[PDB]
Amino acid sequence: YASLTEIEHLVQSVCKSYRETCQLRLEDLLRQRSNIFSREEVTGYQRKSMWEMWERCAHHLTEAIQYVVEFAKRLSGFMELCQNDQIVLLKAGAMEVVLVRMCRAYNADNRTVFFEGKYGGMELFRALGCSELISSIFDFSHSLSALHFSEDEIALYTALVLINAHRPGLQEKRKVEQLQYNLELAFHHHLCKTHRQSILAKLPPAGKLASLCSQHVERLQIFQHLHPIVVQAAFPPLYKELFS
Amino acid sequence: KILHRLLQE
């Protein structure tokens, strides 16, 4: 892009796509912070079977991914890429975007996340048998939350998470690069304008998101090997398309 | 497949 007016238009446009595609409004999440699972409800979650809690989490991830697909669809540049590259970007990026969007549902004051109508701590997911992954996700959401990420910042940051020209498989790499660089300009322009450039150094390191995605795939492979019929019969087709 | 349908609709 040439001149601040085109960069600023991009900023507004990305922010709007984000707002239209966020699954939950931020104030609905904040208004729920006192609604916390009782110890008896926690125990109830801990006693659920591994396979049932996997299914539930997969369903919830699938719904979050659907909103990310709509996000990508509303970024003009994205829909200008060829279909192969759309899919490449979404298969590598969708989970990473959800993982970023989850910080909004995380309360750093008590280390809880909004899940199925109330806030609960990481002990809520014990039945999954992936304590390392869960703990890493909670830690990631705590990092971002410490930054006090604004809605506008999440918009712009998650547009960049998705439009990543380093994804293996991209055919029009140069085109993705151009889009990535215009979105980087937009993000950094907005940071500069809002006096928020101090967060650049505090953003999680490159590959952190990749590490969570790969743990997620690795824990999935173990679960699937234990319960292959559950995955086939009861995991969402989109989920399996992105991760199996 | 599902992605291709979500991107097309």
From Swiss-Prot, chain A:
Give residue ranges for domain NR LBD: 6-244
Subcellular localization, as worded in the UniProt entry: Nucleus
Q: In which tissues is it expressed?
A: Isoform 1 is widely expressed in many tissues, including liver and adipose, and highly expressed in skeletal muscle. Isoform 2 is primarily expressed in immature thymocytes.
Q: What is the effect of changing residue 64 to F?
A: Completely abolishes transcriptional activity
In which residues does the motif AF-2 occur?
238-243
- Free-text comment about domains: The AF-2 (activation function-2) motif is required for recruiting coregulators containing LXXLL motifs such as NCOA1 and NCOA2.
The annotated subunit structure for this chain is: Interacts (via AF-2 motif) with the coactivator NCOA2 (via LXXLL motif). Interacts with the corepressor NCOR1. Interacts with CRY1. Interacts (via AF-2 motif) with the coactivators NCOA1 and PPARGC1A (via LXXLL motif). Interacts (via AF-2 motif) with PROX1. Interacts with FOXP3. Interacts with NR0B2.
Q: What does this protein do?
A: Nuclear receptor that binds DNA as a monomer to ROR response elements (RORE) containing a single core motif half-site 5'-AGGTCA-3' preceded by a short A-T-rich sequence. Key regulator of cellular differentiation, immunity, peripheral circadian rhythm as well as lipid, steroid, xenobiotics and glucose metabolism. Considered to have intrinsic transcriptional activity, have some natural ligands like oxysterols that act as agonists (25-hydroxycholesterol) or inverse agonists (7-oxygenated sterols), enhancing or repressing the transcriptional activity, respectively.
- Protein's name in the database: Nuclear receptor ROR-gamma
The species this protein was found in: Homo sapiens
Upper lineage is:
Eukaryota, Metazoa, Chordata, Craniata, Vertebrata
Which residues of the parent protein does this chain contain? Answer: 264 to 507 of 518
UniProtKB/Swiss-Prot annotation, chain B:
* Record-annotated disulphide pairs: none
Q: Where is this motif: LXXLL motif 4?
A: 3-7
**What is known about its processing and modification?**
Sumoylated; sumoylation increases its interaction with PGR and prolongs its retention in the nucleus. It does not prevent its ubiquitination and does not exert a clear effect on the stability of the protein.
**Where is this gene product found?**
Nucleus
Task: Cite the record's tissue specificity text.
Answer: Widely expressed.
Q: Which domain of life is it from?
A: Eukaryota
Q: Any notes on this protein's domains?
A: The C-terminal (1107-1441) part mediates the histone acetyltransferase (HAT) activity.
Q: How does it assemble?
A: Interacts with PPARA; the interaction is direct. Interacts with PPARG; the interaction is direct. Interacts with ESRRG; the interaction is direct. Interacts with STAT5A (via FDL motif). Interacts with STAT5B (via FDL motif). Interacts with STAT6 (via LXXLL motif). Interacts (via LXXLL 1, 2 and 3 motifs) with RORC (via AF-2 motif). Interacts with ASXL1. Interacts with the methyltransferase CARM1. Interacts with COPS5. Interacts with the histone acetyltransferase CREBBP. Interacts with DDX5. Interacts with the histone acetyltransferase EP300. Interacts with ESR1. Interacts with GCCR.
Question: What disease is this chain connected with?
Answer: A chromosomal aberration involving NCOA1 is a cause of rhabdomyosarcoma. Translocation t(2;2)(q35;p23) with PAX3 generates the NCOA1-PAX3 oncogene consisting of the N-terminus part of PAX3 and the C-terminus part of NCOA1. The fusion protein acts as a transcriptional activator. Rhabdomyosarcoma is the most common soft tissue carcinoma in childhood, representing 5-8% of all malignancies in children.
Q: Give the protein family.
A: Belongs to the SRC/p160 nuclear receptor coactivator family.
Name this polypeptide is given: Nuclear receptor coactivator 1
Q: List the gene name.
A: NCOA1
Shown residues in whole-protein numbering:
688 to 696 of 1441
